[model samples]
Structures are given as C-alpha cells and as structure tokens.
Target chain A: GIVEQCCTSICSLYQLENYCN
Target chain B: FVNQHLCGSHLVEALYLVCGERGFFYTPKA
Candidate 1:
C-alpha cells in the first residue's frame, strides 16, 4: 500500500501520471 | 521502506528526464 501511495504522490507532485511509465 | 525509497528515487529521475532539461541527452541529433 505504501508503494502505491508513493506512486500516486509522485504523480501528483510531478504531473507525471502517464510519463512516469 | 526500501522499495518505497527506490520507487521515490526513480520517480524523481523520471521527473528529471521528462520535465527537466536533462532530457536533452536523450534526444541528441547526429
């Protein structure tokens, strides 16, 4: 769950929801 | 904790590559 949350947070902060892939 | 740290690091790396100027390295022209 922490890993998932981290990913979500990263996306939100960096605007990389799709680019992070 | 370790995996989360690793994931976070990679996220920053991704941010740099995607949003930062360092991406220039990946788009070099010969």
Candidate 2:
C-alpha cells in the first residue's frame, strides 16, 4: 500500500508542480 | 547504398509522428 500511495503521491505532486510552475 | 548526414542538422523531414509505447511519457495539451 505504501508504494502505491507513494507513486500516486509523487505523480500528483509532479502534476501539481508542473502546473504551478 | 549509403545514407546519412549528420547529427544536429536541422532538416525538416516530410513525415513525423511522436508517440510512445510501453513506457511513461508526457506531452502538454494545447
């Protein structure tokens, strides 16, 4: 579960960071 | 038969398609 969550979190964060910047 | 000229030469080819297969890739929508 943690790996899945981490992947999802990182994917989400990457999207957000790309969008915000 | 021989063909080639070069790395970094900017020549516009007649056909181009960008796609991905079995891996992660991203593109921005416009």
Candidate 3:
C-alpha cells in the first residue's frame, strides 16, 4: 500500500527514527 | 522515482491517521 510504502521509506531514510519506531 | 517533497506529506498523513486511531495527538515524548 502507498501509505505503508511512504511510512517505510521515510522511516528508513531517517535511520528508523520518527514514525518507523 | 521518488517524489521527495510529497513523500513527507505521505508520512505526515500516516502519522495523522495513527494518532486518530490512538485517540490522542502524539508528541515525541508520547
């Protein structure tokens, strides 16, 4: 899903910080 | 190809949805 894609991508970019946690 | 600027919006929206479900606005301390 696009939402999950965005979530995972953004989180990964931040090194698993922010929403990735 | 990623829409770099729009991607942040997607993340924000996802966070908004999560907070909605959680019934509270999330702060970093939360």
Candidate 4:
C-alpha cells in the first residue's frame, strides 16, 4: 500500500508527502 | 507551483505536473 507509485519522473520516489509545497 | 525547473540546459532536474494531491505527487505510470 505504501509502495504503490514510483517514477524515474515524467520519469522517482517520495512516500506521497510534503516535499516542496 | 503548477510546474518547476531544477536548472539544466533546457530541461532541468524536475518534478511535475499533475497529481492526485498537492505536494505529495503521484502521476500514474503509462
């Protein structure tokens, strides 16, 4: 569940949380 | 910030675009 999405970014990862908001 | 550019030649290191939520982004794979 905590690992459902990812990217290399348009094609990376950060567990769906506040990064640069 | 609907879009971003992390500084490069023409396409910087970046995070983007549309997400199911704000800040915490997840663009479904193709």
Candidate 5:
C-alpha cells in the first residue's frame, strides 16, 4: 500500500521531487 | 489551540483519529 497519496496542489518542491524521481 | 499556521490552507488528515491507539500511535511520532 502507498504511504501517502500526493495531493494535486502540494508544494512545488514536493511535486518536483515526486515527479523527478 | 489555534494560530500555529494558516487556516483555509492545505490540511491533511491523519490516517487514524484517536489518541494512544495502535494505528494512531505510529503517526508522525517524532
């Protein structure tokens, strides 16, 4: 199971790292 | 009990909503 689902408008830093990875 | 941060702002819910329960215990216990 996933620990957390990323929200649509999360911080840019978090979104960048999430997608970049 | 208020004013630590902004309201109407982003909010996240803990997976559990109780205190001292098993599922609740592991949440952000730093």
Candidate 6:
C-alpha cells in the first residue's frame, strides 16, 4: 500500500517543504 | 516505461482503502 506524506507541491513544491510535509 | 500522477487524489485514495485492510468498525451500522 501507499503510506507517505505528500508535499503536494505538484508544480515543484512537492519536492520542497511547501507541500511535501 | 514510465508513469506518474497527482498526489491529492492518489494520497487520499490510499487512506480510503489501506485503512480498511486489517481494521474494524462495522458496528450495528453504529
């Protein structure tokens, strides 16, 4: 299954802390 | 081959299904 925290910075923030918490 | 998608939809779907795997709460519909 998929247990993860998405930094939904989909536009790139996902890779950063903006949304990838 | 490669594949990708969104997080909002994908992540929530996980909790929706994964949380029920080995859990409970049928109740009397209670």
Q: For this target, which candidate reaches the highest TM-score against the unseen true structure?
A: 1
Clashing residue pair totals per candidate (backbone < 3 A):
0, 0, 0, 2, 0, 3
- Please report how far candidate 6 places residue A1 from its true position, in Å: 18
DockQ of 5: 0.07
lDDT of 1 by residue, B1-30 (tens): 212332545655655655565342211121
Quote each prediction's TM-score.
Answer: 0.32, 0.18, 0.29, 0.16, 0.17, 0.29
Can you write out model 6's per-residue Cα lDDT over B6-26, one digit (the tens) per residue?
A: 355554443344344443222
Indicate whether candidate 1 or candidate 2 has the larger lDDT. Answer: 1
lDDT of 6 at A11: 24
The TM-scores that each candidate's chain B achieves against the reference are 0.39, 0.15, 0.40, 0.15, 0.14, 0.37
Interface RMSD of each: 11.7, 17.3, 9.0, 9.5, 12.5, 12.4
lDDT (CA) for every model shown?
0.40, 0.22, 0.40, 0.30, 0.24, 0.30
Candidate 3 regions exceeding 4 Å error are: A1-21, B1-6, B21-30
Indicate the TM-score of model 6. Answer: 0.29
Tens-digit lDDT track for model 3 on B1-30?
Answer: 233332445555545555454442323322
CAPRI grade, predicted model 4: incorrect
CAPRI docking class of candidate 5: incorrect
- DockQ score of the complex predicted as candidate 1: 0.09
What global local distance difference test value does model 1 have?
0.40
Model 6 residue B19 CA deviation in Å = 0.5
Provide the lDDT at B25 for model 2. 24
Could you tell which candidate, 3 or 4, scores higher by TM-score?
3
For residues A1-21, write the lDDT of model 3, one tens digit per residue: 333444334343342124433
- Decide which is better by DockQ, 1 or 5: 1
